[PDB]
Structure formats: structure tokens, C-alpha cells
């Protein structure tokens, strides 16, 4: 392409054009799309901000003589392996002052993306390089898969022993060597390259390979083992730093699963994860059952599955998407959740109310809704609700949110019914369409797994607190949902939150309800260390809901005696409902001491925001003492903490506990350094 | 019933009639199940052995005047609380000098094994009470859920303020106490059991009641909060000690939660595990959909789920497959499994062996094959295998077992096809029953979720070693599989690698094979801490299979350049396909060094059970060391080990170094005392 204005760069480094015919941005050119990415972040959260070229960096990483990783500059296409790294400092809204993570991908133009031993290797490397650092790590997947190859070193010179050379048809007994071959190899310090046995028959001397080896590494098993020291290198790496995927063309084997075990994955239209490709499924059932991998991993596969998180409409999307993820994530693992206030400050009423008798999408009392009248400002911060999981297990909504400033994740309860449909599966003629009616309110198995698996994502590497907006009737019980262990995705629930490790608010919404199973699985006393519950002063709770407390404690006889207040059974079985309701009330609920406190939803953003603060700062002054004793239960360490306070200090007074403890962190500390003399030999 | 030769049971203590009538054991004889069960284990350990009722003890547990447990013998029946436990001391063929457990169970006579918060508080006690000692907790569930009630104490007195007394059917505005009402209750100090707000109108003094909270407690949320602390208790117990529940008689709620939180769980037939009811959800569907509770949590449905790993013809069935289960668990949390050696000694040669040309059933080549010409011995000692979630996912077969009396978990591939036939949708007119075909040797979402399930189960509580018979093609990549999650539950393997804690084998069986993906999450470096990889001389293994290889490397043209050895493509492509099969062979895996060594099936036995015990050994040095230092890697602590050695021992020598080990234990350990001058200040 002649006369362009400025250098072509698919020219100078014509992997970049390749690249780009395989409809992928080339290896090299990403770190820039997170400048660019990065740079927009700032754009949106003060248009005014100056932003010089030096508020980001990257660094390609690449192991040195001894295999450690260090930084170099060199020119794009130079790597010799498929897997490329880059360390990157950027300073953001979150973190003014520079944050950083590490970005590792796939060479799609080396050997088509393929993972080689040494691919695996450095991909290894870079995750613990990651880990030791307790920075995130980003994968960017665009490959084939294993990779795989025979001894071409053997295809021109191996000989086959026939049964009758006249008629090759008739079969063969092996294949072998001629004294001829094993020297060809000799000359090539190639004789590793088979194991044979040497045995003459009448004519010629034969050697009978038994097993070929190859000179060329990469072959098979080897490219197996170094699969699976990622795939658990990736396992480890979840529960440690923040993990997240981006699918920028088509992700195979190892690729596919690796996208999985980071969790938190972006996949981009039309970029299919897979396990064995369609022309090969279709080979061995002999028949033509699929067109495209797209049917067996595009975004109608993974993103209704949960396994693809949020879709991009290209790569630069799932970038921008990756980069906004992040800005809810600790700077590097176990630092202070980024506080990043903007105009929507704290103090304020929530507008958005729902009403029991019309319709709403609990997102509106998230993020406030738009109206034709005004804004009316939900219970977090205006703009702040980043949405995941959202093509799979529409019962459930989560998310990240900001509350005054303080990230957190959020789940709420879709109360629309959700139209679940599911497309019939080509392999089967049989197969047709169905629709799925998932009742709102209900947990139902893959709504009960969302939860788990969005408080397991909070937890582990983004270690955000959380709040929940309970509102379930129960779990679905019927035969259906029964049978497909909806108890066991319950329970998965129960073990998420005895794993939490932040602070954790359960809050029972206006016309919303918590009711038997329900408020089982996400009551306080699961982690009585991080869980406290709020019922709002217009919610419900109870074993059963009226309907059912007549159905088995106002019975047809209880009614009559009570029809000793002078046909007219519909009034009265309606008293009788409205007895039972008279119980599941947040008064009683703060009478039998099972939640901390009731509210008002219009004032709950008020309250919430100075709880949740106090919170965080009398953990982070639990954990400043748990690194000195090595022996106090939280019980003792928030007692000896709460005994620092001001006599005049009123424990309960969020606010103040809060502000006294941010006057004095310097003084707290000074304190801390005082109790060295806690060296109990 | 008159003139019995003995007292009758069900007269003395009348609540055992109730019981029985229930269709369950009384709760108070439970403890004689055990003892009878125990004394069958006996019989068939050795029909000789003469056993004295001091072989069992079983002691009531109760808590005191503080809330601390402890053991009383007292008449049946005078529990005051509708939860029991007992604590068990029993002498048995693996723990001949006594092992201890604990029982707890609902007692389906106390208010029907409701769960009240009493209840909870002295379940949740019992739990801890277990997991302080480190001795297996075994619930015995027969209830009916969280306890339900109204303030009955209020249903008399209250008053509807009509809109007019003449006709009710117009509505009412609210409730209310007269003064006379407001007095009754304050005659018996139940003024707490409502909130009301008094004002006047006209006519009488009414105060409108606001809230009912009745002086009875075990209502509502009450009871719920109760919930949900044992949900979380046996959610923490399950990773702590042996948990095992056995389901007598409907298991409802909150019960049916905590038969899955423990995990382990034998149903006996005809006791459902549900959480709402038939009657209630047909109720709302308000159509006759459900006709018992056995069509949503029978057996059909939970033995099929995996939720229920074994059934039970009846109770006492139950209880000897806990104790059969148990004999393989160590007598408390973190100390030696117990060895139980048995006729069947280790020194001899696999009998049973798989041929390519014909189908078999795996469980011959664990537990050996009864043959006409008598018997063959399998892999493990013979008897030894327990299976256990044989009615779940098919696609593996999993169990316990013992290898010349060690026990240890198994994996292995079932060859055979699966039919799996899934009952229709009674809610729904369009359902029927499908038929799905899960081909053998490839992992599905089920079978993939079974495996993780298992080798946790084999990890947690259990803390046994474990050998994976490993032999799956790969994972199903079709549509519906992959849309079913596949990725997700293929995960959970490797995730479950990763936190194991015990010896690992994966080997590869004769006729067997291990592909691509398949290698991948049971690769040992996924924790090579415990894992060890071996292949059968007569396996296969490589990223693809054969027809692949040749499919990409071995095209069309390729295969015609060596038509250059003299239409005849029918045997040539068959030479490509034995060419590829050169390179999957144990020899090549010895050679890249991704198994520890391959071997030959009939000399298995032998070999693993050195290897094994050899293992055993050394975990257990690299433990007591681990008590000390406090900082230094198991490559550091495994070494400093091995530098005890004499030096005329053969490291790579299991039975060797095993013997040497169990010759100097006492030696051993008095070298690690002297090590005590580590205390690094
Ligand atoms: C297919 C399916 C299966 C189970 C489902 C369960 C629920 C939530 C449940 C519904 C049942 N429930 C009740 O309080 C209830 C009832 C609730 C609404 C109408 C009638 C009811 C009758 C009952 C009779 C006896 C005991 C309880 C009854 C508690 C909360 C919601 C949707 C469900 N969908
Ligand atoms: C519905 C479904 C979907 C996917 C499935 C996958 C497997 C195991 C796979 C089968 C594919 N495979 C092969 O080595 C293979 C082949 C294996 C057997 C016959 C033909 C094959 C053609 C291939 C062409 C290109 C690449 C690989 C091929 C590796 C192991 C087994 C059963 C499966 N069932």
C-alpha cells in the first residue's frame, strides 16, 4: 500500500498484518489500547484533568540467562516464544499516584497461538511474578490450543515391513530402519529420535522402531504437562491476586479453560472458546452436525453459561471493560479498597421506591432511575453500578457499585419473571427450543450458583465488601429444579459467605421478603465476624408467608371459634391472613434481636455509607493488631481496639467511631508499635 | 397388647410407638443400631473373635447448668429439647484398642423434629463440641424443618375494627385490644407479646396493634437465624472433621440442607429430602401437580443427584454402611489412616486384566472379577471397595478401598455406555422422559462435577491418599454439553488438586488412554507436592488420538509423498495411523519425563503398595518436622529428611526407605527433639 501519509506498520512488522487477518489486534499493540483505554477512564471521571504521555508505562517482560524475568524495550515481533508479558504503571482516578498489573498473552502469528513447553513456562512465570507481586493479572487469550507435531525426522527415511510386497493391500507386520536410516540420524545427532529393536530377517539388517520420540520438542505429552502447570498455576492465582480474562479470537484447550479457572473472563463477539473443535466433533460422528465453533463456544454459549462474564463488541470494548472492572480492585492484593468519591455525595435521601403493587427492575433502586420528571438518585452512587454475569441466571442481579465513594459488590433480586430460553441441540434431531418461565424472588439452581460464585469473585482477588438486598420467597422446589441439586448450589451460597473475609450487610428491601430456606443461607450467624442484617420497616420475613400460616395454624376450625364476633368466611380467612402478616413484621424481627436494626429505605444510603466506613476502618485496625500477638480471637481484638476510644465515644455512633479513628490512625499506630513489648516466649 | 415374654419397649416409653408409627427407629435406639452394626463388622473381620459388651459404650450427651455438655445416663424419652446426640466409644477390627464419634439426631416425636432455636443452639454445640476433638460427627435427620407458630395468646382477644358491624363482608381497617384485652395480658405478664399504638375513636379506648410478637418462642426468624448458624456449622465441620448423615424419615428444610452440607449422605428409601412440600407447591400452582414428596427428594431424585451417595433398605442398613464407610477415616482429625491388613496380602500379581478387543467393567480391575474358573484378583484387596454416588454420573466410578491394608480413595473410568434416563416434568403437560446416551471415557458436566466431588470428600474429614485410574478421551465439546458448563465443573477438578493434602497416584490403566484436555486437569504438576503420574506400558496418551494426528499432520498429500515405497490408499493411511501411535507410547513419556515411570499391570499391586506406603512415611516425617521451623519448603524439609538416610539406602527404593523409617521411628524422632536448638530469635 504506497504513499500513506505515515509509515505502515503492517509492513515493518508484517506479523502485525497476519494478525489482523485473523481478526485479532496484534500481541504488541495492546499495551496501547490500555493507554488509550486508561486515558478515556480519565476523560470520564474529570474531562478537565491534563493527562501527559507519562501516566502510563509498559515494559515487555522476558526472562534473562537465568530465567527471571526482567524489563527490556525492543522492537515489536522480536519474542521467540508464543507467549508475550508487559508490566504496566498507570496512574488512575482510584490511584493518582500509579497502580500497576501485569498483561500476558498469546502470539496468535508464533505458530498460531499454540502452547509449547516453553509458552507454558513463561506464562507460569509471569503468574507467580504476579502473585509474589500482588499485582492483577490480565490474560489476554488468542490461541490454538496445545501444540502438537510428529517426528518429520522419520517420515522420509521409516521403512515398512509388508506381508508380500507384491500386494501392499494384504497388510504389514511393522516399520523399521535400514542400516541405511539409523546412520542418516547419526549424522544428525539425532538417534534419540527413536527407540528400535535390531533384528535381522533372512535379506536385510532391520531395526524395528518401537517407539518415535522426535528431536523436535513440543510434540505431545510435554505440551500436556506444561498445560496443566498453568492450569493449576491459574487455580492458585484466583484465590490470590485479581484475575481476569479477555477472548480476543478464538481460545482452545488449555485456552478454554484457562479463561475459566482466571474466573472473571470478557469474551468478544464472535471469538469462540472451545474444547475439540466442530470439523473434528463432526469427523467422528461421521456426520455434519455443526457449522461453526460459534454454536459450540460464542457469547450464546458462554455469556448465557456465566463462564463469559460480559460480552465486548471488539477488543478495545473488552479492554475498556477489563480497565473498569479494575477500578474497584485494591491496587495490589491486600491494600485498602481504591475510595474514589465523586458528586453524588453521600449525604442524601434515595429517591427510586418500590411499591407492592407495580412492577420495577431492581436495578432502579441500585443506580437510581432515569425519569421524565428529573433523575431520582437510587442507593448508590449515580453511575457507579458495573453489572456482571448479566446474559446468565437472570433471577439474580450482580455487580460492583459505589457507595459514597466505598466499592463494594452488590446482588439484588430480579422481581420480573425471567424468559429463559434455551436452543435445541443440533447433534439431536430430536431437540427443539425450549422456554424456560424462571418466577421472580425464587432461587432456582443457576441463580443459586450466581451468588455463590459473585460473593466467591468479591472475595477472592477484587476482596471487596459486599451488600446484599435479600429478597427471595425461597428456592425452587418442585421436581425440575429438585433434581437438578438445586441444594447444592444453595449450599455453595453458605460456603461463600463462611469464606468472606470483608465487611458484609444483609438488608432486606422495602416490599421485599426473606422467607425459610431463604433466610437460611444468608443469615448472619454464618460468619457472625463479617455479617450484620438490616430489615427495612416495609419488608416481610418469616418460616412461611400468611397464605401458608393460615394453612396450617388458622386452620377451617380456628376460624369458626373466632366467628364469635357475630357465608361470610372470605372477610374473615382475609383477617386471619392479615393476623399471620402481623408477625412477619421488622419490629418483631428487632424484638427476637435477628438483625441489628430496622430502616428506612430513604434514609438507608445515609446510614449505609457511615456503617460501611466505620467498618472498614475498625478491620483494618483488627488486622494491624492480628500481625502482632498471633493469638486473640476477634471477640479480644476488637474489644482491646473499642477500649482505645474516647470514654466519650459512643460506640454505636457510626460516624464518630469513624471520625475519631481517621483523626488519630497515626496515634492508633503509635499505640500498636507500643505493644512490641507482646513478645510472649 | 398383652402377655408378652418380655416388657413392651413401646408401652414403657410411648414415644417410641410414635416413632415407629412414623416409619422411623426411635431416636433413643439408635445407639443399639450401632452397636449392632459394630459387631457385624467384627463377624465379618473374623468370625472368631469373641466380643464382650464393653466393646461399646454409648453415653448420653446433654448440656449443663452452663450450656456445657456433658454425659448422663438417664431414662429414654426425657429429653427436654427436641435434639438429641450421644457420644460413641467402639472397638473395631481398624481401631481395636477404640475409636470415639458423635450422633446427633432430631427426635421426630418432639414436636414433630421441628428445629427450634433450642434445638439449633444444642445441634450447633454438639458440632463444635466434635471438631474441638477432631472425632467424626453423624447426624441421623428425620424433620420437619424450622418450627413454625402464632401467638396463640392473642387469637382470642383480638378485635377488627369493622368499616360498619353490619355488614363484616365490606372490610376492616385494622386490629385491636380493649382495655380489657391490654389487661388480660398484663395479668400474666405478657404485655411484650404485642405493640400497640392507643387511640380513641369515639366510642371505646382501642389500641391498635401493630406488631404481634407473642411470648412463645420458636415462631419465626427466630428460628430461621437458628437455621442458618447450623448451615454454617456443618458447612465449617464438613472441612474439619468426618461428617456423614443418614436420612431416616423426611428431611424438610433447614434438614434438607444440612444432609447436603455435610456432604456424605445415605437416604434410605422412602424418607424424602425436600424442602417445600407437595401439598403446599401444588397449593400455589393451585392444581393437583404433586401427588407425594417422594416425587421431589425420594431416591429417584437425590440418588440420581449425587446429593445422596448410597441408599439404605432400611435404617439399621444405613447405620452398618456409616460404620463400613468410617472404617476407612482415621479415629480423629489429623492422625494416621487406619491400616487394616487382611488375607488378601500385597505380594502377588494382578489377575483381571482389560484387552482392547472387549468390553469389561472397571470394577473388575479394582476389586477383581468373579470367574468360573474362580477368581481374579483386581488391583486392590479383595472386598475392600466401598463405591459410593453410584447412582450420579455414571461416566466414573468412585469409591474407597484398600491396597495390602491401606485405604485409599479410587477413581475410575466406566468404559461401558451410560444410559441415562431422565424422568418427565409432572408441572409441566410437555414433558417427557429423555434418554441420554453419555458415551464411555469422556468426561461430562456430571461425571467431570462427580470427580471433584469426589477427590473432595477423599481430602476433607476422610484425609485419605487417593489413585486415579486415569483413561477419559477428553471432555464432550459438543453444543449441549459445552452449554451445559462442562468448562466450569472440569475446573472443579483441578481446583480440588490443588487443595489436596494426602498422597496422590494417577495411573494410567493398560488398555486405557489420556487425550488433550483430559491430561490436562489431572496433570501432577497441578500440585506436585502430592502428585505422582504413572503409565501402563499398554496405554496411549498424546494431545490428540491417532485419526487426528494424521487428520493435521499426516494430510492427503503428505501420504502420497511417501507412496514413494512402490488405489492402495486403504492400507498406506492405515501406516500413517500406526505411524502417529508410535509417538503416544509410555516409552516416549519416560523419555520427556512427564511420568515418574511406566509400568506393567500385573506387577501393579506391588508396586504402588510400596510405593504408597513408602509415601506414607515420609509425609508423615515431612509433618512432624513441619511442627518446628515454622519456614522452609517442602523441597527444603523433604531433603534435610532424606539426609538421615544410611547412606547405603537406595532413595529410589520404596520398600527400603519404608523400612528403614518404620525400623527408627522412635530414632527418627529423637533426632528431630534434638533439633529443638532451632528456635530461630
Ligand atoms: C416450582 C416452584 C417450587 C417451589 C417454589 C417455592 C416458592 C416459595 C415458597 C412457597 C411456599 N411457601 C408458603 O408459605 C405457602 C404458600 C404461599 C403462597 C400461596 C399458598 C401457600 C400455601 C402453603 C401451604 C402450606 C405451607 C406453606 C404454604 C413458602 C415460600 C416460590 C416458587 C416456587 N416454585
Ligand atoms: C458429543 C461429543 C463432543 C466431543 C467429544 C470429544 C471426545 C474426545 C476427543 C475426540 C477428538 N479427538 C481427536 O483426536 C480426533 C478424532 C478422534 C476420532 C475420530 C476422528 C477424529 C478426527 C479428528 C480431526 C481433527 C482433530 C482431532 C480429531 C481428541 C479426543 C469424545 C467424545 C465426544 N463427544
Known amino acids: 500500500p504506497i504513499a500513506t501519509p505515515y509509515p505502515v506498520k ?41 493527562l501527559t504521555d507519562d501516566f502510563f508505562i509498559s515494559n515487555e517482560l522476558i526472562e534473562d540467562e537465568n530465567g527471571e524475568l526482567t524489563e527490556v524495550e525492543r522492537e515489536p515481533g522480536a519474542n521467540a516464544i508464543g507467549m508475550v508479558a508487559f508490566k504496566i504503571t498507570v496512574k488512575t482516578p482510584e490511584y493518582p499516584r500509579g497502580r500497576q498489573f501485569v498483561v500476558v498473552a498469546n502470539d496468535i502469528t508464533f505458530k498460531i497461538g499454540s502452547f509449547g513447553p516453553q509458552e507454558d513456562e513463561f506464562f507460569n512465570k509471569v503468574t507467580e511474578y504476579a ?15 496445545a501444540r502438537i507435531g510428529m517426528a518429520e525426522e522419520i517420515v522420509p527415511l521409516f521403512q515398512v515391513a509388508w506381508n508380500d510386497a507384491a500386494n501392499p493391500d494384504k497388510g504389514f507386520q511393522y516399520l523399521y530402519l535400514t542400516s541405511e536410516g539409523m546412520e542418516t540420524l547419526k549424522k544428525f545427532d539425532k538417534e534419540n529420535s527413536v527407540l528400535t529393536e535390531r533384528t535381522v530377517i533372512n535379506g536385510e539388517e532391520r531395526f524395528v522402531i518401537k517407539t518415535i520420540i522426535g528431536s523436535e520438542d513440543g510434540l505431545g505429552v510435554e505440551c500436556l504437562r506444561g498445560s496443566g502447570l498453568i492450569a493449576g498455576a491459574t487455580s492458585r492465582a484466583y484465590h490470590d491476586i485479581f484475575t481476569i480474562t479477555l477472548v480476543t479470537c478464538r481460545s482452545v484447550g488449555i485456552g478454554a479453560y484457562l479463561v475459566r479457572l482466571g474466573q472473571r473472563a470478557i469474551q468478544v463477539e464472535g471469538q469462540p472458546i472451545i474444547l475439540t473443535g466442530a470439523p473434528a466433533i463432526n469427523k467422528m ?25 460480559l460480552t465486548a463488541v471488539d477488543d478495545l470494548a473488552g479492554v475498556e471493560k477489563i480497565v473498569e472492572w479494575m ?46 420528571s428529573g433523575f ?22 450482580v455487580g460492583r457499585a459505589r457507595l459514597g465513594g466505598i466499592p463494594l459488590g452488590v446482588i439484588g433480586v430480579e422481581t420480573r419473571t425471567v424468559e429463559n430460553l434455551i436452543p435445541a441441540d443440533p447433534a439431536n434431531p430430536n431437540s427443539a427450543e425450549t422456554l424456560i418461565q424462571e418466577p421472580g424472588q425464587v432461587w432456582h439452581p443457576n441463580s443459586a450458583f450466581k451468588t455463590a460464585q459473585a460473593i466467591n469473585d468479591f472475595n477472592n482477588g477484587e476482596q471487596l465488601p459486599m451488600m446484599i438486598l435479600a429478597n427471595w420467597r425461597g428456592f425452587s422446589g418442585g421436581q425440575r429444579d429438585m433434581f437438578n441439586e438445586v441444594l447444592k448450589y ?10 468472606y473475609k470483608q465487611p458484609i450487610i444483609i438488608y432486606i428491601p422495602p416490599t421485599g421478603e426473606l422467607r425459610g430456606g431463604s433466610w437460611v443461607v444468608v443469615d448472619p450467624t454464618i460468619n457472625a465476624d ?43 380467612g382475609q383477617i386471619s391472613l392479615q393476623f399471620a402478616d402481623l408477625h412477619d413484621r421488622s419490629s418483631r424481627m428487632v424484638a427476637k434481636g435477628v438483625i441489628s436494626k430496622e430502616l428506612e429505605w430513604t ?26 500477638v498471633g493469638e486473640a480471637s476477634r471477640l479480644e481484638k476488637i474489644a482491646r481496639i473499642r477500649s482505645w476510644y474516647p470514654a466519650s465515644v459512643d460506640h454505636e455512633d457510626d460516624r464518630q467511631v469513624a471520625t475519631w479513628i481517621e483523626e488519630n490512625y497515626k496515634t492508633l499506630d503509635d499505640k500498636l508499635k507500643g505493644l512490641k513489648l507482646e513478645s510472649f516466649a
Chains 1, 2 share one sequence.
Open 131 to 145: 502473585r509474589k507481586r500482588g499485582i492483577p493479572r490480565i490474560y489476554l487469550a488468542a490461541n490454538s490450543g
Open 490 to 499: 444453595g449450599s455453595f451460597i453458605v460456603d461463600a459467605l463462611v469464606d
Open 530 to 572: 463479617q455479617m450484620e442484617m438490616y430489615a427495612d420497616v416495609n419488608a416481610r420475613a418469616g418460616v412461611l408467608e400468611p397464605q401458608g400460616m393460615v394453612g396450617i395454624k388458622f386452620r377451617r376450625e380456628k376460624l369458626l371459634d373466632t366467628m364469635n364476633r357475630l357465608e361470610l368466611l372470605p372477610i374473615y
Open 10 to 50: 503492517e509492513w515493518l512488522q508484517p506479523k502485525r498484518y497476519k494478525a489482523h487477518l485473523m481478526g485479532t489486534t496484534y500481541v504488541y499493540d495492546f499495551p496501547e489500547l490500555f493507554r488509550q483505554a486508561s486515558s478515556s477512564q480519565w476523560k470520564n471521571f474529570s474531562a478537565d484533568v491534563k
Open 285 to 309: 460422528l461421521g456426520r455434519e452436525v455443526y457449522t461453526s465453533n460459534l454454536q459450540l463456544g460464542g457469547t450464546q454459549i458462554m455469556y448465557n453459561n456465566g463462564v463469559s462474564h
Open 603 to 628: 434514609e438507608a444510603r445515609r446510614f449505609f455509607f457511615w456503617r460501611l466506613r466505620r467498618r472498614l476502618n475498625e478491620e483494618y485496625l483488627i488486622k494491624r493488631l492480628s500481625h502482632q
Open 376 to 397: 431520582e438518585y437510587g442507593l448508590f452512587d449515580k453511575g457507579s453500578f458495573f453489572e456482571t454475569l448479566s446474559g446468565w441466571a437472570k433471577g439474580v442481579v
Open 327 to 372: 477500578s474497584y480492585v485494591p491496587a495490589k492484593r491486600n491494600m485498602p479498597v481504591p475510595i474514589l468519591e465523586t458528586k453524588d455525595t453521600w449525604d442524601r435521601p434515595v429517591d427510586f421506591t418500590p411499591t407492592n403493587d407495580e412492577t420495577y427492575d431492581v436495578r432502579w433502586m441500585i443506580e437510581g432511575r432515569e425519569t421524565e
